């Protein structure tokens, strides 16, 4: 058997940051070469592990997290960064052991009229804990007066839409991000490299 990395990387549809998608890779052999020898990736940052050595290690589980963010926000995905995406949408643990891979998807996720279907969270009472997902659509209370399920003064919708257009600059252009977390539990290892 073989791990379904291609399905995560080459997936026809990607998820929004607030509803980032999690894929569990287990009980398979993983050839990381296709990722680390590829040149289509604009961002490739591995924390706690070297990409070249990865084929030799074995892990208990692998988690692939998929989402789409603007280019300037990609820095936030890396651990220890503040930002709307990092604080309200997707947070990486300070003790992160894994790889962050990102590539330009302007040819894929942009339209002439503009793609506003990719969303992010603009407002939240508390900052997200590592690997926490908020799918809530509840109206944000900025004041004492309850919204009662209606957007109003001092009462705002928490989510906002990316505007993705082909001419927009590279930071402003959509980027697809996959985060591979290599989890080592006190249990039999089910994901291994070629060796």
């Amino acid at each position: 058997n073989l791990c379904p990395f291609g399905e995560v990387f080459n997936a026809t549809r990607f998820a929004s940051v607030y509803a980032w998608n999690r894929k569990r890779i287990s009980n398979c052999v993983a050839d990381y070469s296709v990722l680390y020898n590829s040149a289509s990736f604009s961002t490739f940052k591995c924390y706690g592990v070297s990409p070249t050595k990865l084929n030799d290690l074995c892990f208990t589980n692998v988690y692939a997290d998929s989402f789409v963010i603007r280019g300037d926000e990609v820095r936030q995905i890396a651990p220890g960064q503040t930002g709307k995406i990092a604080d309200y949408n997707y947070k990486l643990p300070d003790d992160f052991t894994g790889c962050v891979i990102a590539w330009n998807s302007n040819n894929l996720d942009s339209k002439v009229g503009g793609n506003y279907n990719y969303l992010y969270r603009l407002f939240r009472k508390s900052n997200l804990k590592p690997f926490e997902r908020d799918i809530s659509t509840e109206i944000y209370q900025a004041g004492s007066t309850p919204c009662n399920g209606v957007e109003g003064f001092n009462c705002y919708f928490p989510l906002q839409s990316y505007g993705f257009q082909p001419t927009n600059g590279v930071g402003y252009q959509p980027y697809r991000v996959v985060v591979l977390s290599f989890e080592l539990l006190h249990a039999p290892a089910t994901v291994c490299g070629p060796k």
Partner: antibody
Amino acid sequence: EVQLVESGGGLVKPGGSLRLSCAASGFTFSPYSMNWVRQAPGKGLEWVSSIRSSGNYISYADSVKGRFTISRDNAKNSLYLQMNSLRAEDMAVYYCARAGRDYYDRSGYQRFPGFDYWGQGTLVTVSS
Amino acid sequence: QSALTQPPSVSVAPGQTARITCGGNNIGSKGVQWYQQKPGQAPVLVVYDDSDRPSGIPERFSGSNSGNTATLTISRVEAGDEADYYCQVWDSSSDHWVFGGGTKLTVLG
């Protein structure tokens, strides 16, 4: 969110010995490498020392030699610098700062980001 | 990498782009980090990893690194932009963090 507060310092006599502390809030201490930086009056920035938790990796500046020791308590989220045998050149504002996690590129080369969070600083004065 | 060279001073018009150059051998391998220090204030990181900019720093601030020589570019300069600017690199050989001498931005007129 993240604030680093530096205590200690003050007046030290020539040849005197001074410990410093850096308390940290908002981030888990051990994964991040923590360093000490000093700026002399009317002078440029100088790096005193760095600590790394993984192997207790310790690096010191060439000018600090056998007189300075860097200590970290990860449970307390605190950083310590013991300064012995102090001279006039060691008179500076000392900053405790957190450093971004080193990462390996796709080729496998290790790249080190630099000092995302600094502190207000504390002044050590070396007068008799 | 054990030595980083920076211009002593650079003067810029109020609306024009400013470039500060940090030079050392094989600086791109490990990373150039730039700091802005205003008088009476602690250093602030303006760009890291030769190109990445911390949150809350204006988009005008950008950095590049071209082999030995690295440049920090302020697209539109302002009175507030004036500060001492320092560059930083890491030595695996000596295990030392190396800082630049500093560059003083002075906005004319």
